[PDB]
Amino acid sequence: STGSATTTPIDSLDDAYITPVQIGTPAQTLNLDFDTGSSDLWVFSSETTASEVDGQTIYTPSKSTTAKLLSGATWSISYGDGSSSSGDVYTDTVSVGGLTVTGQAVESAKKVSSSFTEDSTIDGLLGLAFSTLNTVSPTQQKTFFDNAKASLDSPVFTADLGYHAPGTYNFGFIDTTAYTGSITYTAVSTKQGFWEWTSTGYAVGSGTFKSTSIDGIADTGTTLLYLPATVVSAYWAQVSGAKSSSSVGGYVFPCSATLPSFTFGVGSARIVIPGDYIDFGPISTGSSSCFGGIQSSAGIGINIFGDVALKAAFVVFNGATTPTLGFASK
Numbered sequence: 001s002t003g004s005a006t007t008t009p010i011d012s013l014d015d016a017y018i019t020p021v022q023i024g025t026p027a028q029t030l031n032l033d034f035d036t037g038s039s040d041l042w043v044f045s046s047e048t049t050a051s052e053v054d055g056q057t058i059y060t061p062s063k064s065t066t067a068k069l070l071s072g073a074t075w076s077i078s079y080g081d082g083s084s085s086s087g088d089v090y091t092d093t094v095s096v097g098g099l100t101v102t103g104q105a106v107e108s109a110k111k112v113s114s115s116f117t118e119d120s121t122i123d124g125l126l127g128l129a130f131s132t133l134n135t136v137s138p139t140q141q142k143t144f145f146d147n148a149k150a151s152l153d154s155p156v157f158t159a160d161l162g163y164h165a166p167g168t169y170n171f172g173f174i175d176t177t178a179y180t181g182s183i184t185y186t187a188v189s190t191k192q193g194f195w196e197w198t199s200t201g202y203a204v205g206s207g208t209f210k211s212t213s214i215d216g217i218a219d220t221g222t223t224l225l226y227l228p229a230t231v232v233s234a235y236w237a238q239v240s241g242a243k244s245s246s247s248v249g250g251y252v253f254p255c256s257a258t259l260p261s262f263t264f265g266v267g268s269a270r271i272v273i274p275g276d277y278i279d280f281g282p283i284s285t286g287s288s289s290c291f292g293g294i295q296s297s298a299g300i301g302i303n304i305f306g307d308v309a310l311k312a313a314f315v316v317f318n319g320a321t322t323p324t325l326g327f328a329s330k
Contacts, residue, residue, distance in 0.1 A: 001099055001100075001148070001151045001152055001153065001172055002098070002099060002152065002153055002170070002171060002172035002173045003095075003096045003097035003098045003099025003148075003170070003171040003172065004097040004098065004168060004169075004170045004171070005019050005020060005021075005096050005097030005168070005169050006019070006020075006097075006166050006167070006168055007019040007034065007161065007162075007166065007167050007168065007169050008166045009162070009164065009165070009166070010119070010121040010122065011121070012164070012281075013280055013281055014161075014162075014163065014164060014223070014307060014311065015223050016033050016119075016121075016122060016221070016223060016307075017033065017034070017161060017167070017220070017307070018031040018032065018033060018121060018122060018123075019031065019032055019033075019034050019096070019126070019169055020032075021094060021095070021096055021126060022093075022094065022095040022096075023043070023059050023064070023092055023093070023094050023106055024059070024061070024063070024064030024065075024066060024067055024092045024093060025064055025065045025066040025092075025093060026064075027095070028057075028059055028060065028063070028064065029057075030043055030044070030057050030058075030059060030123035030124055031057065031121065031122065031123045032122070032123060032124050032125060032126040033122050033124070033125045033126070033221060034125075034126050034128055034159075034169055034220055034221070035125050035126065035127050035128060035129070035219070035220060035221025036127075036128040036129055036159070036194075036195055036217075036218055036219055036220040036221065036317065037080075037127075037129055037194060037195075037217060037219035037220070037221045037222060037304075038077065038079065038125065038127040038129055038133060038221060039127040039128075039129045039130060039131055039132070039133035039134040039135075039143050039193065040075060040077050040107050040125065040127045040133075040134055040135055040136070041094070041104065041105065041106060041107060041124070041125065041126045041127060041143065041144055042075065042077070042085055042087070042106075042107035042108070042109055042124050042125055043058070043059040043106060043107070043108060043109065043123060043124035044056040044057065044058045044059065044109055044112070044116075044123050044124055045058050045059045045060065045061070045087070045108040045109055046058055046059070046060040046061070046062065047087060047088070047108050047109065047110050048087075048108075048109045048110060048111070048112060049110065049111055049112075052111065052112050052116075052117045053117065054117050054118065054120055055120030056120060056122070056123045057123045058123070059106065059108065059123075059124075061090045061092065061106075061108065064092055066092050066093045066102075067090045067091070067092045067106075068090060068091050068092070069088070069089075069090055070088075070089040070090060070091055070105065070136075070139075070141075072138065073088065073089035073105075073136050073137065073138070073139060073141075074086070074087070074088055074089065074136070074137055075087060075088075075089060075107045075135045075136045075137070076135055077135045079221075080222070080300065080304075081115070081222075082113075082115075083113045083115040083116060084112075084113045085109045085111060085112040085113065085116060086109070086110060086111050087107060087108045087109040087110035087111065088107075088108055088110065089105055089106070089107050089108065089136055089141070090105075090106045090108055091103045091104060091105055091106065092104060092106045094106065094144060096126075096144065096169070096171065097169070097170075097171065099148055099152075099171050099172065101144055101147045101148050103147070104144055104147055105134075105136060105141035105142070107136065107141075109124070125221065126144055127143050127144075128143060128144070128145050128157065128220070128317065129143070129193055129194050129195065130143075130146075130190050130193045130194070131143050131146045132190070132193045133193035133194075145157055145171070145317075145319060146319075148171060148172075149319055152171060152172030152173075153172045153173055154172055154173060154174070155172075155318070155319045155320055156171075156172065156173070156174065156316055156317060156318050156319060156320075157169060157170060157171045157172075157317050157319070158170045158174060158175070158178075158314065158315060158316050158317065159220055159310060159314075159315045159317065160175075160178050160179075160314050160315070160330070161220065161307055161310055161311035162311060163274075163276075163277055163311050163312075167311070174316060178314050178330065179313075179314035179328035179329065179330045180328065180329050180330055181328060181329055182269075182328065183314070183316055183326040183327065183328040184266045184267045184268070184269035184326065184327055184328070185267075185316070185318070185324045185325065185326045186198070186266055186267055186324065186325050186326070186327070187324060188318075188322075188323045188324050188325055190323060192217075192302075194217040194218075194219070194302075195217055195218040195219075195317060195323070195325055196215065196216070196217050197215075197216070197217075197218065197325050198213050198214065198215045198216075199213070199214040199215075199216065199264050199265050199266065199305075200212075200213065200214075200265030200266065200267060200268070201213075201214070201264070201265040202214070202227075202231055202262065202263060202264050202265065203262075203263040203270075204234055204235050204238050204260055204261075204262060204263075205238055205260030205261055205262075205275075206260075207238075209263065209265070209270070210234075211265075214227065214228065214231070214264075214303055215302075215303060216297075216302060216303030216304055216305050217302060217303070217304055217305065218305050218310060218315060218317070218325055219304050219305060219306050219310075220306075220307065220310060221306075222304045222306030222307065223280075223293075223306055223307050223308070224280070224293050224294070224295050224304075224306050224307070224308050225262070225273070225278075225293060225294045225295070225304070225305060225306055225308040225309045226295050226296065226297035226300055226302075226303055226304040226306065227294060227295075227296070227297055227303050228296070228297060228298070228303065229296045229297075229298045232251065232294055232295060232296045235260070235262055235294050236251050236253065236292065236294070238260050239253045239254075239257050239259060239260070240254070240257065241253060241254040241257065242254075242257070242292070244296075245289075248283050248289070248291070250291065250292060250295040250296070251291075251292040251294070251295060251296075252283060252289045252290060252291055252292060253289070253290050253292055254288065254289065254290070255281075255282060255287075255288045255289065255290040256288070257290075258275065259275030259276065259278045259279055260275050261273055261274050261275050262275075262278065262294060264305075264309060266327040269327065271309070271312050271313045271327055271329060272312060272329070273308060273309060273312040274312070277293060277308055277311065277312060278292060278293035278294055278308060279292075279293065280292065280293050293308040294308065312329075313327045313328060313329065313330065314327070314328040314329075314330045315327055316328075
């Protein structure tokens with residue numbers, strides 16, 4: 001089997017991407033944030049504290065003839081950005097782009113943090129990291145991909161995120177029309193439960209490539225590119241007037257700037273992030289200070305190849321017995 005679904009930016013900045021997901025019988029379609037940095041499929045629901053729901057579409061398990069309470073199971077997750085959610089668990093039928101999994105754990109939120117409430121466009125998350133990170137207790141549950149894998153034509157999914165435009169998540173096949181040149185594959189460590197890999201270096205604008213190993217994670221659920229302070233300083237030094245602002249929470253730059261590109265290495269291959277992908281717009285409405293899309297990972301504890309990086313590529317998440325990651329230009 002295969003599946004193919006369009007993923008759409010939630011706003012004009014590509015702050016996140018939402019993908020429609022069918023849950024239950026009859027189908028209830030919710031728009032979920034596909035997140036290769038976490039491993040829980042959780043949704044706003046009829047169980048979510050009413051004051052914490054503000055415009056989201058909810059899953060109502062009592063209206064699904066295939067929903068079953070997973071007795072005694074609870075979940076609770078905290079994300080890198082400080083947001084969180086928790087609740088109980090149902091199993092139900094879940095379909096993405098025509099690919100169906102029966103008996104998928106659907107984690108129903110009883111509580112969500114303010115950032116989730118405040119984002120009316122995201123109805124929940126669909127985790128695509130390794131199932132070892134799943135938070136369900138006392139019996140850990142499998143991700144949608146893990147459940148689908150054996151049925152897929154090939155044990156892979158691909159992320160093809162757009163810049164200020166829709167893109168695609170495919171399951172079970174590689175669309176050879178969706179990228180240019182070849183896909184370069186690189187090793188993955190699953191030791192921390194992430195799609196963790198090592199970039200071979202970087203360049204800023206038309207500058208020379210610096211060969212240096214940068215360990216980080218391919219994370220579709222993180223907006224920005226978080227890299228070591230040395231790398232990030234070298235980038236912003238090429239933008240007149242750019243500075244790190246403790247009050248704002250990272251590098252800012254004059255909105256009048258033309259940003260240089262940023263290149264990262266994948267083996268001997270190179271992925272070029274155009275400068276415009278690094279612009280996240282005014283820090284507040286009407287400001288002439290703009291927020292940068294490349295930020296320091298110092299004090300995160302891990303480098304994160306988030307959407308800013310991934311949307312410059314066609315990315316293969318290869319879930320073979322020994323997982324690997326592939327990147328192509330597009």
